[PDB]
Design a protein around this ligand. Sequence first.
Ligand SMILES: NC(=O)c1ccc[n+]([C@@H]2O[C@H](COP(=O)([O-])OP(=O)(O)OC[C@H]3O[C@@H](n4cnc5c(N)ncnc54)[C@H](OP(=O)(O)O)[C@@H]3O)[C@@H](O)[C@H]2O)c1
Ligand SMILES: NC(=O)c1ccc[n+]([C@@H]2O[C@H](COP(=O)([O-])OP(=O)(O)OC[C@H]3O[C@@H](n4cnc5c(N)ncnc54)[C@H](OP(=O)(O)O)[C@@H]3O)[C@@H](O)[C@H]2O)c1
Ligand SMILES: CC(C)(C)C1=NCCc2c1[nH]c1ccccc21
Ligand SMILES: CC(C)(C)C1=NCCc2c1[nH]c1ccccc21
Lengths: 283, 284
Amino acid sequence: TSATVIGLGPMGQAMVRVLLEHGTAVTVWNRTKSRADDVVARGAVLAGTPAEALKAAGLVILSLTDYQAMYDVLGDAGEALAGRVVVNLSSDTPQRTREAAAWLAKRGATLVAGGIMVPAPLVGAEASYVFYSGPRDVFAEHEPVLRHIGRPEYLGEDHGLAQLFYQAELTVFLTSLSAYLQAFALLAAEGADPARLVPFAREVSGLAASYLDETVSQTRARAYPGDLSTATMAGATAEHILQACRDAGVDLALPEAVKSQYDRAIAAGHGGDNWTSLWEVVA
Amino acid sequence: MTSATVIGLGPMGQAMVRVLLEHGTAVTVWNRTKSRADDVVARGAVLAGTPAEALKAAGLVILSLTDYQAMYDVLGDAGEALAGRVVVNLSSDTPQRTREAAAWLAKRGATLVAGGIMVPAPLVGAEASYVFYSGPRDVFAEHEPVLRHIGRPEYLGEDHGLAQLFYQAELTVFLTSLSAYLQAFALLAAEGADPARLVPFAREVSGLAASYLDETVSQTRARAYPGDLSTATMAGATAEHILQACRDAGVDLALPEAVKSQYDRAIAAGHGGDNWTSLWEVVA
Ligand SMILES: NC(=O)c1ccc[n+]([C@@H]2O[C@H](COP(=O)([O-])OP(=O)(O)OC[C@H]3O[C@@H](n4cnc5c(N)ncnc54)[C@H](OP(=O)(O)O)[C@@H]3O)[C@@H](O)[C@H]2O)c1
Ligand SMILES: NC(=O)c1ccc[n+]([C@@H]2O[C@H](COP(=O)([O-])OP(=O)(O)OC[C@H]3O[C@@H](n4cnc5c(N)ncnc54)[C@H](OP(=O)(O)O)[C@@H]3O)[C@@H](O)[C@H]2O)c1
Ligand SMILES: CC(C)(C)C1=NCCc2c1[nH]c1ccccc21
Ligand SMILES: CC(C)(C)C1=NCCc2c1[nH]c1ccccc21
């Protein structure tokens, strides 16, 4: 089989190296042509233009920073797009993903939206999985090649779905990473060693994740029993974190935001309810 | 035969009282809301009439209150009932206010050991339970054989602020992770998808985040942020996609805006090509 990969960031390069090793014939284009040097040594073919890349295969995988990069790179391709399957594995909003399907469908191209849920060194590892959404039959046709990148997770016909799941996962992932930096900054600022927090940070992350079922259960019921923990109690800590960050001279954005959820839930009369009562503020 | 007081009968105070009783400690309690002692008294706790009495019932006084102000509201009228006591305060507050509370207790001849219990009420006394402690090493060592029943004691050092500092850093991780779960669930629900469907994927990605802890420590200690695997520009684009997706679906923007603003500021300070860890330069 032949595949085209447009975008040779670490994710693009990992996908090329995987599809090559599984004996696919891979055509690449990149904005920065030099970054193709590695995958070309491994027998990827370098296209001169995006439109050239599109002509080299019926399966076109984009790994770009956002969906605007797709418009920037393919806006000029005209009839090179007709009959192509565009598998867009780029971050963007659900609404821009849905717009992109219409856009591509006017130029006679099919969108399959995806999101790869592992970093580049795990692409095509056992851990690797990818959300997909858009037309099932079209996806099914290329699933056999795409699967080398990771366990497909087909979500449905709405192109926005894979993107919604990706953005929901990355809210968890990026916000957690920011919370690690926040926790480390608070220690470092008070002269303690962030290294000493690590084992306890793992513990508390594992603990946080053990609340997922109760969060889903209570929020879908809009029922927030406060017997084990009140928004008043949790909100007090949110203020203690903010004040400790003010005292230590570290950034306030993240703890301000968390405190704001508790303050609005308390002002709204959920002081005696579970922390899940913040759903009444966030949702 | 050992003796202990617990002041504060929220879920954690009660949890701690049942654990101590079940380990054969004599437990005297006081709560602002005397009714909440019903179950622990039925388990052999003694309900003191006043805070002053409860202090005199043991030399080991455990506080489980919402903040350290609650300790002032309750121990203000104590005076010399406080003389010679070990106050193990297991309440959330700032490091600064913990250090202040030590000085304040020492004027009334009482010793502070600050602690932070790192598990919820149901896991108090369970294998997973652990408690940060900081304060005088010899005083703490004296009451540790009773305290360790509540969970594995982690003694951090002499500075009373230390346990409060590690507690606040842990709850930064914990409370922000919970808000992030709400944020993710809100986004699915607003677009008519079922949050229940994200749960196993949300669990997996929390695991993935935690596997970055060592590289985060390494890169921020060095202030060295190689972007070969992930740039702040790429992670920042997604931070903006989250805020834009939430804006589109009518979900609260506060938490995604906080995260997106770290990326904006790191990129504007010239770290666009660096690792996400370069946000250290804006956060620290
Ligand atoms: N890194 C990860 O761990 C990871 C994991 C899962 C998903 N993702 C997602 O996968 C996608 C790719 O990420 P990545 O980290 O591999 O790389 P990235 O740093 O997002 O770069 C991806 C590619 O996009 C190109 N690009 C960006 N804007 C462009 C534009 N306006 N016109 C033309 N080309 C443009 C870059 O070109 P240049 O090469 O010329 O700079 C690069 O080839 C992103 O949507 C990201 O959210 C990343
Ligand atoms: N829930 C958890 O999972 C958990 C886990 C670890 C640590 N913690 C921390 O442990 C402490 C106890 O939390 P919790 O969830 O068990 O309960 P909580 O809802 O904070 O209440 C604890 C106690 O504080 C009392 N209180 C609050 N303000 C007071 C005041 N001004 N004067 C007198 N009493 C006052 C309450 O009295 P009334 O009963 O009269 O209202 C109650 O006995 C907090 O610092 C919390 O951050 C909680
Ligand atoms: C969650 C994961 C691994 C799929 C991922 N997607 C792109 C955002 C991102 C990811 N891994 C990262 C690691 C650092 C910064 C952003 C990262
Ligand atoms: C992290 C843990 C379990 C020790 C904890 N400390 C007090 C804040 C708090 C805790 N667990 C909670 C669960 C819900 C709301 C607040 C919570």
